[PDB]
Amino acid sequence: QSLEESGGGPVKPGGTLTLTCKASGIDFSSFYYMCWVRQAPGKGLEWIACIVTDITGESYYATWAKGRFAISKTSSTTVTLQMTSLTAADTATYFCARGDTYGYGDTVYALNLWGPGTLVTVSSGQPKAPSVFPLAPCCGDTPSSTVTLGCLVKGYLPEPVTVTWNSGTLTNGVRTFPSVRQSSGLYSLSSVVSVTSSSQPVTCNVAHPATNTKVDKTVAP
Amino acid sequence: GPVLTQTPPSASEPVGGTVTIKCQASQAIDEYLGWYQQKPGQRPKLLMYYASTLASGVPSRFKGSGSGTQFTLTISDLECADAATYYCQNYYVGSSTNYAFTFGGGTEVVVKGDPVAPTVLIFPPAADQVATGTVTIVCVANKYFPDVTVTWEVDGTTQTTGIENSKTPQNSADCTYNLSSTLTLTSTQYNSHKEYTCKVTQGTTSVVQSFNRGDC
C-alpha cells in the first residue's frame, strides 16, 4: 500500500489548484480516512480535511479550511483537494495520508500511511530556472588522492530543486544541502560529491519542475 | 478544542539517554492520540496510536502513555536515528459533526553524539560566474558535531552581508552535521580583493581555508 500526491506547483494569489492523491496496492474490505495535511517551510503539521472511503463519502474539515478547500473521492483510488482563493499563507508541502476507521476498536486508529508530499507555492513571482555553476577546488592547489567536486544551483524560483549525480548512478559520498534564500527572494542550494582523482568526470543533474527544466553540468578537477 | 500543545519546544539529550515529550489536550480525548516522527525533508511516520500502542516496526524503547488531557512520548536509549521533530495528533470521529484531527505544535529532539571536528573545503567561483555581475563563494564543513560558527574574511575584513548558511540534518548513524556556507559579492567587489577566507570554529578549535584570487 502506498500514496502519491500530484498537481502541486506555482500558482498566483487568488488562484486555484487541484491536488490529487493516488492510492496503490490497497483493498476495499475495510473503510479508511483519507486526509490532507500541509506543512509550510520550517513549520508544523497542519490538518486540513478528511473523507471516509465508504459510500457515504462523509468528509471532515479543519475550521480555517472548510471555506476554500474541498475534498473528494474521484475514484476507488483517487482523492482530490481543490484549493481556492489562495494566498502566501497557503504555501506549503501538501501531504496525502490514510488511517483506519474505528471498526471494532482494534484497528490502527491514526494516520499510518503517508505520501512524499507535493509543494505548493502561492506567489506573484514568476517561476525562474536556476543557473548551475561547477564547484571544484582552486586549481592552484596541489592535487591529492581524492577530491570533492560539486554544483552550485543559483537563483531559482520557486522551490523545489532536486539533484542527482550521474543520473542516480552515483550516490556514495554525496551530500546535498537544504536550499537557502537570497535577499531578492530567489533560492540557491549546493550539492557536493567526494570522488577519487583518477575517476571520470561527474555530472550533476538539476531538476526544477516549476519551469520544466533539467540542467546537466559536468564537473572535473 | 481539543487544541494540542507540546512542551518543551526543543529537547537535547546524549545518545543512550532519555527524552520525555509532553502533549496537552485542552479537553478530554480519552486515548485518541497518536505520535509521529518527522525528520527534515521526509514524510511523517506513525510511531504510536491509542496513546500507547506501538506501530508495527517501531522499537520498544519508544513508550507512549497518558489519558484525558495529558500524554507523553518517552524515548529511552536514544540513538542518532532518533534526531527529529515529534508531533502528537488527535484522531477521532464520533459523529458527522464530532471529530478531531489536529496536530500539536511539535518538539524537536537533538541527539548529542560523539564530538567530531570538521574538515573544511572552499570553492572559488567557476569562471563563468563573474560575467553575471555577481560571484558566489562556497565554503563546506564536513561531518562534525557539535555545531560550528562560520566567519568570512575578505582581505582580513570580516563579512556580515551576502552570507547564507545551510545545515544538513543529523546523520542517523553518528549524529554529525554538514554545513554549506556561501558568500555572495558583486563581481567588481570580488575583483578588488585578493584573499578570500572561510573560518569554521568549533568550541576552542578553528579550521581555516582560504584562497587567493589570481591563483585560481
Binding site: 473503510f31 472511503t53 | 480519552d30 484525558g68 470521529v93
Partner: peptide
C-alpha cells in the same frame, strides 16, 4: 456498508 464511529468521549 458504513464505517463505524468511535464511541463518545468517556472523559
Amino acid at each position: 456498508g458504513k464505517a463505524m464511529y468511535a464511541p463518545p468521549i468517556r472523559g
